[PDB]
Design a protein around this ligand. Structure first.
Ligand SMILES: [Zn+2]
Ligand SMILES: [Zn+2]
Lengths: 141, 143
């Protein structure tokens, strides 16, 4: 569950889970578009007397610093905000079934080309690399 | 094995005759743990085949390399080794309607090389799944 995992990230990164923060995350997880701060404000202000466009931007900054949101900029336009779903990279042993997680700094080139050729709007990716782990390789010479 | 069956299908589709010798070499490659030399293949099979020479082994490996079934691993002066190839796969997957669209990309060499270094794995092949929203779903969502 995406909201549950976002809240876990906040707790882990020491961010207070305020009602406004919860509501902004909920909005972001449920929205398909990349909203502006004004969009978020318009949607939520009716339930938060002390919410302002400033308060929305301030929270979005906290989220960006926690890795939950990316800020999209264009020309003279107000920023838009993309909720981030994690990518995953795994090495999988074909002999013993061992799975090892690793880190790689993104696959922008592939994602950009895939978006173009398939017409999809891209969220995130999972890469599985198959082969033989160090232990099995040693065993099999 | 499923791997062998798929290799035989490739041969059939590309017009390569499926001879006993070819079948035996493919079966050997599919079953091999390390990348064999031509000499390894020859010695493994020579008992079964009277007309087999080291030349016919190399000739068949060239045919398989051309068909995309085998890659040759070269080393300065030294005898080459041969790697049976498992295909990579690239898929775009729609989170809204479940649509999967296959696409082509020319390998992920930089990622594979780094992954082997950090994890210690010897790499065979990969499957990349990209998640998003398809064109059709985006149209309804208000793109
Ligand atoms: Zn293993
Ligand atoms: Zn769709």
């Amino acid at each position: 569950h995406e909201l549950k995992e976002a809240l876990e990230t906040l707790k882990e990164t020491g961010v207070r889970i305020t009602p406004q923060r919860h509501a902004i995350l909920e909005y972001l997880v449920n929205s398909m578009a990349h909203p502006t701060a004004d969009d978020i404000y318009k949607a939520l202000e009716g339930k938060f007397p002390n919410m302002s466009v400033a308060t929305v931007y301030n929270n979005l900054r906290v989220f960006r610093e926690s890795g939950l949101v990316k800020e999209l900029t264009y020309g003279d336009a107000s920023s838009r905000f993309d909720f981030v779903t994690s990518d995953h990279y795994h090495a999988i042993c074909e002999n013993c079934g061992k799975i090892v997680d690793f880190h790689y700094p993104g696959l922008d080139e592939v994602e950009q080309l895939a978006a173009h050729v398939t017409g999809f709007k891209v969220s995130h990716h999972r890469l599985e690399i198959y082969g033989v782990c160090q232990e099995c390789s040693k065993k099999e010479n």
